[PDB]
Amino acid sequence: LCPGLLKGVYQSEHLFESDHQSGAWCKDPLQASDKIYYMPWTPYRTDTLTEYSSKDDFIAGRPTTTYKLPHRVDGTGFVVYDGALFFNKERTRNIVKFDLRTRIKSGEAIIANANYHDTSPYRWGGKSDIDLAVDENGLWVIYATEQNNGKIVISQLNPYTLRIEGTWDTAYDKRSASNAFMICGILYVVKSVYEDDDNEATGNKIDYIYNTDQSKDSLVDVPFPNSYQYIAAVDYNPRDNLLYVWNNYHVVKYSLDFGPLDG
Amino acid sequence: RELSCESYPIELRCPGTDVIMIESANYGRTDDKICDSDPAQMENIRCYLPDAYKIMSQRCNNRTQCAVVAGPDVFPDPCPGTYKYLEVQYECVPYKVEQKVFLCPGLLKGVYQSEHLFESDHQSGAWCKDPLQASDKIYYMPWTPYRTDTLTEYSSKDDFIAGRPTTTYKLPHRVDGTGFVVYDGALFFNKERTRNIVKFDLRTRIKSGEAIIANANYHDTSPYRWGGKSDIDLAVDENGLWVIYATEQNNGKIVISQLNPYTLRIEGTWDTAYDKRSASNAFMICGILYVVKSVYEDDDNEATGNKIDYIYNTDQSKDSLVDVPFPNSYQYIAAVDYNPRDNLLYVWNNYHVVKYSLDFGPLDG
Amino acid sequence: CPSVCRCDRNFVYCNERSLTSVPLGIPEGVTVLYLHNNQINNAGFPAELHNVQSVHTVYLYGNQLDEFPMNLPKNVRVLHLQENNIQTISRAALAQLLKLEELHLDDNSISTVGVEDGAFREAISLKLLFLSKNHLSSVPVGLPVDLQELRVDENRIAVISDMAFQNLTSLERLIVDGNLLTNKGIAEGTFSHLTKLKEFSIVRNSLSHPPPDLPGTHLIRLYLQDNQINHIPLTAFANLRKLERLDISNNQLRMLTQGVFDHLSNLKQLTARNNPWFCDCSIKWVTEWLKYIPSSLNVRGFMCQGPEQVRGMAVRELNMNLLSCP
Amino acid sequence: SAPGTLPHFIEEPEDAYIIKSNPIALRCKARPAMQIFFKCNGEWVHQNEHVSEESLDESSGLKVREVFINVTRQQVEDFHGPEDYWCQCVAWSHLGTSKSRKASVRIAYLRKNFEQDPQGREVPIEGMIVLHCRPPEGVPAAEVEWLKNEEPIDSEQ
Amino acid sequence: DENIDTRADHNLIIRQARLSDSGNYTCMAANIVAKRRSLSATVVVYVNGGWSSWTEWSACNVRCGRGWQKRSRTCTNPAPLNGGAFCEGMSVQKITCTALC
Ligand SMILES: *[C@@H]1O[C@H](CO)[C@@H](O)[C@H](O)[C@H]1NC(C)=O
Ligand SMILES: *[C@@H]1O[C@H](CO)[C@@H](O)[C@H](O)[C@H]1NC(C)=O
Ligand SMILES: *[C@@H]1O[C@H](CO)[C@@H](O)[C@H](O)[C@H]1NC(C)=O
Ligand SMILES: *[C@@H]1O[C@H](CO)[C@@H](O)[C@H](O)[C@H]1NC(C)=O
Ligand SMILES: [Ca+2]
Ligand SMILES: [Ca+2]
Ligand code: NA
Ligand code: NA
């Protein structure tokens, strides 16, 4: 299933320009469907998910149905796994499982020692303390603990039992990072330059990687594209092998290159 | 859940010895048919206050019973000409509390030199870290008379020494003195030629409020021994936000007042015996004032200084004469601020940016 | 020491005491005199006050004055006459205080006609003049020759004469921001005779392009924000070989001509957020210039507004070699 | 030949109150005047916001100028200063300038519940009684009027 | 004093703030059981500002042509007291004069 190690990230598609400066968007990689799940981020007001029938309807702004969530969502770590929505509940270190078919909450898991509600978010903040990821290995939780001194802590989560099936501690600080994504059980840390930081001129590149199987880390230099400056969320889809990036008010899709440098 | 309209106090109580825990709080209007008033005030059904949770957690949380007056005394007005209400969702949990961070370290026994970062281009200025937000962000403001209007943000300690800034904030008004401080992602500063404290949210990059410190002397009237419009000094400790100043009613002597970081109002006033112009700087720890008396460049037949010679308790309202040796390597002490998260002093002394380590007594009483 | 007024050491505190005049009992050892936030009218100034030689700093802000005061302490260096109603400036008043170096006249009702011809020139030792937040329509004529800082901002100044900045060679900081100033208002090379000028600012005005014939001999900082600058001519930024900080943000600029910044060799920072930059072939030189630029120079704010295809994108990086432009 | 003096104000700006998000403008009249501008909350108001009307009054010989400036609800609710949203008027003449009254724009409101309702009393034929009344909170301050059996009473009667 | 009187329904009425000036007034109830003191009320009398009489016109600064003449009007008759409202209007008066040469 694994395509290999990441070599370079490149621009692929530009859908539209949304009214919100932050948010996230993704497709369910388990279910063979062209359904798009849209999430606009509003501080202390995020509580609805928008479903779209196809790519054409998403650009035209023709929604199929809107889900009314039981609790307020914190951050841009929205992920869909086999017809169920996985989100971080506001002012808590708790993933919440919500089945889209039945439209009812199926579970609530406590991510142990995890920092929450603007304590340890990404560079831009916005309560992005807990970020969910989907790859070839399964469901993952990217967060930070005070035990690791604000550094990124990655844990595999079971999508059924909602329990931690392993914990890994990295050397990279979460607030220093812009966003992160999982591919073949390998973490990719994105470092980027933001808006209103008129002092900054540095290049936006991926400078850190962490393998779960080997439990070893390395310093990389993979150039990351940034047409705009406010990078909100970066999610990987294992079915299409593309990145679901939300930069500034715009909603984009990124193409990925792979190398066979893996044991 | 609990609900109460404007100017109507709310009551919260858990059974037995159980503690109250706030989940979601909002002060404004979401629904129009809950409260009963004039229909003109009910036209706007989209009023919100995010700081509502922060206020309730500071008063109701880790307590058996709670009574908060839903008005301007505890909650700042978000939308004027609209009849507001308080919506609170709470759960009953055991009576356990979290240690070290909020808790008082004791009485100051001795100050020692800890870190030397660099030697800034300006003789006087001020630097600090936000103790509420768990981040390694450093806020820098080098004071330039009749020209201070910018606050510089640094990503880490390494970037601060190397001189690599993250972002610079363009303030709406000119700043007077080296008394600024940062409290929960908001900047508090003394506006030039005024006895006013300006609240500026760093996230939104807009002014949220302006408070008048009553009878306070301003603009080189009653500053510290070095002058430089130091008339009003802001402090942060275990007790909260504080304002160190001087009034003509107290005859130039130091007047300390607790300020609410949300309502921007005086929640108590205390008068001391120490003259502000005789003092080099001051800092708050556990609601106790520590007066710094230092020696300066150009001091005719002078050697007396580099000490903490006076203390003032707010809870007891009693004062004492101390003799805690204070480090002063370079003579011009510009600013001394205490950070309750790290329990260290943030000093600026004659171009030098230094951090001081603290030692505490076995008890505080 | 006075009874109503409470003196403290080498200072006199007559502040916020509802006084309409200066108290009589003033010692001959005082250095700083505080009389601010009172109701002192221009009529309540005794002659004995002038005789107190020892006083070097006087604070009279937030009072109820009409004219510049008479019989002020002879050997005064710094004066604070702000937040009141000063409308008339006389030659005889400034002739008394010869040793005056720093003068603040902020938030007053000072008009061009109200000031006597060459009244500021009487204060021979004057270096800092703050005519900020007044009712000024133009820069006064008779200014001090040895002046270093003229802060004549936040007024209603629409026109500037060439003779307004005559003999002011020694001037270093000129702040004329927040006025009704246009390019028709500025005279043909008025600022050219200010060799020692280091900082210049015309922010929040109404300039259609930068003022031509600017001094470059000592200029380090140039600020041109919130103006209606449509375009920048090539000649405008040349011969400014000493400049380090330039800001042109919040302007009506669409495109720039190649080599407009070729003489700004000492340039450390350039700011150009919020500008309607139309990204076509006119921005090809901008992207290339941004790539070969040293770490010494920080250029920020370059973001596209047109067309919809490249909307909101940073001019720092191009895609597919700027399409089919080269 | 005409007499030259400082500008004299005729229609000084009066305190405005915003009702149901309807933006209410401020009036200003002076003579002799060539330029009239507004200084709201310490700083000058932009030239574009001003609407001038150089209408010459018959009753007076010199040139009269009238300027109006609109103040929206969004301007007042987003202003986070220490004092109430105030405005002043500055007029220009060949001799000098003159300032007007500080007109304070406020958000108009009124409560339903009375602060203190009048209390009923039993009083003898020669005895004296005082009826207390505390009106509800509102801007501006409420105008209290007394009614004896749903009909007003005249204090001068 | 005729200006101050005690009412049957326990009220203190002051007609003019001249015959009974400012102070910290406190109400006290007495009974055969004991006495009780109430919270003191801070009654402060304020004097509003009133303009003083006009001065004389000054001599024309310019010898030949357009000249100037000044007249001052201070806020001292009466001067504001205990936080009284300040004087309304302008403080200075200026007129153009022509001196014959
Ligand atoms: C008090 O309650 C707050 C609310 O979560 C909690 O964070 C804090 O640790 C508790 N203890 C103390 C001493 O504040
Ligand atoms: C001012 O400069 C002019 C030459 O531009 C010179 O002739 C004049 O004498 C100077 N004024 C003084 C007082 O030196
Ligand atoms: C602005 O003021 C003018 C009068 O000066 C008025 O005619 C106009 O309608 C006002 N604008 C609005 C939106 O009412
Ligand atoms: C009341 O006023 C008197 C002076 O007349 C003062 O001494 C006293 O302390 C004041 N009491 C209060 C509570 O203000
Ligand atoms: Ca992510
Ligand atoms: Ca301090
Ligand atoms: Na996600
Ligand atoms: Na400080």
Author numbering:
A (entry chain D): 202 to 464
B (entry chain C): 100 to 464
C (entry chain B): 36 to 361
D (entry chain A): 46 to 202
E (entry chain E): 203 to 303
Text lifted from the article:
On complexation of FLRT2LRR and Lphn3Lec–Olf with a longer construct of Unc5D, which comprises all of the Unc5D extracellular domains (Unc5Decto), MS analysis revealed masses (367.39 kDa) that were twice as large as those expected for the 1:1:2 tetramer, suggesting dimerization of the tetramer into an octamer. We found that the first TSP domain (TSP1) of Unc5D is required for octamer formation. On the basis of these results, we carried out crystallization trials using Lphn3Lec–Olf, FLRT2LRR and a construct comprising the two Ig and the TSP1 domains of Unc5D (Unc5DIgIgTSP). The resulting crystals diffracted to 3.4 Å maximum resolution. Two chains of Unc5DIgIgTSP (now including the extra domains Ig2 and TSP1) pack into an antiparallel arrangement, providing a bridge between the two pseudo-symmetric halves of the complex. Unc5D TSP1 is in contact with the lateral side of the FLRT2LRR, adjacent to the binding site for Unc5D Ig1. As in the tetrameric structure, the Lec domain of Lphn3BLec–Olf points to a solvent channel and is disordered. Interface E (∼1,800 Å2 buried surface) includes contacts between the Unc5D TSP domain and a binding site formed by Unc5D Ig1 bound to FLRT2 LRR. This interface is observed only in the octamer structure.
